[PDB]
Design a protein around this ligand. Sequence first.
Ligand SMILES: [Cl-]
Ligand SMILES: [Cl-]
Ligand SMILES: [Cl-]
Ligand SMILES: [Cl-]
Ligand SMILES: [Cl-]
Ligand SMILES: [Cl-]
Ligand SMILES: [Cl-]
Ligand SMILES: [Cl-]
Ligand code: NA
Length: 129
Amino acid sequence: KVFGRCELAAAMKRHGLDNYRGYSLGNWVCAAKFESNFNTQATNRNTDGSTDYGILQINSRWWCNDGRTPGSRNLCNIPCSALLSSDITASVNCAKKIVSDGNGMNAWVAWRNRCKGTDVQAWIRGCRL
Ligand SMILES: [Cl-]
Ligand SMILES: [Cl-]
Ligand SMILES: [Cl-]
Ligand SMILES: [Cl-]
Ligand SMILES: [Cl-]
Ligand SMILES: [Cl-]
Ligand SMILES: [Cl-]
Ligand SMILES: [Cl-]
Ligand code: NA
């Protein structure tokens, strides 16, 4: 599913992501924009052989199982395919664990490089939330 901007903001808020660990909704929407362009089916293979899955490009090295990332963990206790669903619940629950892991949203390099420090409220501006 390719979400609209406000549509994703609303779904993220529904699932408790707004201000989670102090990160406002616009930070989450901005991260999803640059990770997946709001496409739940996005996948990308990393140099190390792991793969990133879903709207927030969650990595199989630590967070989900895809059966083909040697030496990896599955700390969200989910198949990586769960992260590609039109229903964002699995991605949101796993992102909550990732953002709690010590480095906040810096876990998402694209968030650090493209969202951090910017006017992230632009991403939810206008939305009925
Ligand atoms: Cl957009
Ligand atoms: Cl915001
Ligand atoms: Cl594996
Ligand atoms: Cl393969
Ligand atoms: Cl594990
Ligand atoms: Cl699995
Ligand atoms: Cl949803
Ligand atoms: Cl933080
Ligand atoms: Na894994």
